[PDB]
Design a protein around this nucleic acid. Sequence first.
DNA 1: AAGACGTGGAC
DNA 2: GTCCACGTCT
Length: 344
Amino acid sequence: PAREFQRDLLDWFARERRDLPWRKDRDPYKVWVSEVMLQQTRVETVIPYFEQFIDRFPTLEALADADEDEVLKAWEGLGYYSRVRNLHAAVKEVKTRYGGKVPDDPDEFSRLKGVGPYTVGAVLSLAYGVPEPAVDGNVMRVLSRLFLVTDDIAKCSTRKRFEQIVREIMAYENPGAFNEALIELGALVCTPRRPSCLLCPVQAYCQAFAEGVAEELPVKMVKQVPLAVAVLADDEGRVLIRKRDSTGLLANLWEFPSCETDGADGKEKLEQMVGLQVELTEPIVSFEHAFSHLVWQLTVFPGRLVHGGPVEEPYRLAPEDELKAYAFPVSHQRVWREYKEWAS
DNA sequence: AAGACGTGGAC
DNA sequence: GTCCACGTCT
Ligand code: SF4
Ligand code: NA
């Protein structure tokens, strides 16, 4: 009863659609940026970042031409920073390989880094009208309730199944609208907790509602790392920072020099990291920072740095008022915050 | 197949 | 505390 389903869904969407910043138009760049920003991030969090980011990088080409530090700094605080290194690389490739036009073919677009099955669907359906499914966590919830699908959401195959369902029931007349409506339904009505079934526009089609199980769907299924962090100031009040490797945790972000210590075993593995001259006094605060897959237990040790050689490697001597220029992870932003109200 | 990869806010 | 949060890449 897909034509039935479509009308009721599409009609609700026309009345209820939020005026989000990225819905001002269907510019593929604009759509693409927002969809990358919205991955594992709440709409409310994204709104300010999207605006500053577009203000700063108005077009695809502006973004491609920007320094990566510039781009990381625009992302600073959003999390999952490889989203933006991927977006940046991908956007560079569209400029050069595709004349600056986001490819409207699913296979070509999917090949860009950071661009996966969901992003292909979202961007190409919204921006160009391509009939590809755009199945996110939202959509998976909706479809898992509509169709009483009890496969584990984490399984790669479950997503494939959902996409089949979309290809079957999608309004091919208007795929962007259909895809966006499915998403908005998940965002506003068919919510993780307490879905608003009595108000849902597609309730008559929904099995979970008829079975009394809306809330139990979809079905679905961390290590500790101790860290010592050094804040080292000149007599000129210039602070020692460093850029992280381009691979792995918090890639390419700047940090106050640190190392994993495994147990509260000293400030010496800190004082060790030489290659220039430092004595370290007693630590001033200790807090912890959660990631998705680990927790940092941080201890920050204030210190005095003397120059006895050049500054190379990934380290860099930044004066105090220039720290605000670099992208720091939130954890290391707090390290600095504590260090400063300390020195009061 | 499943772990890496941030962050903040509702509950 | 938990869940959001499949999103993508590995
Ligand atoms: S009826 Fe309840 S469960 Fe079924 S789609 Fe609408 S909100 Fe989701
Ligand atoms: Na890809």
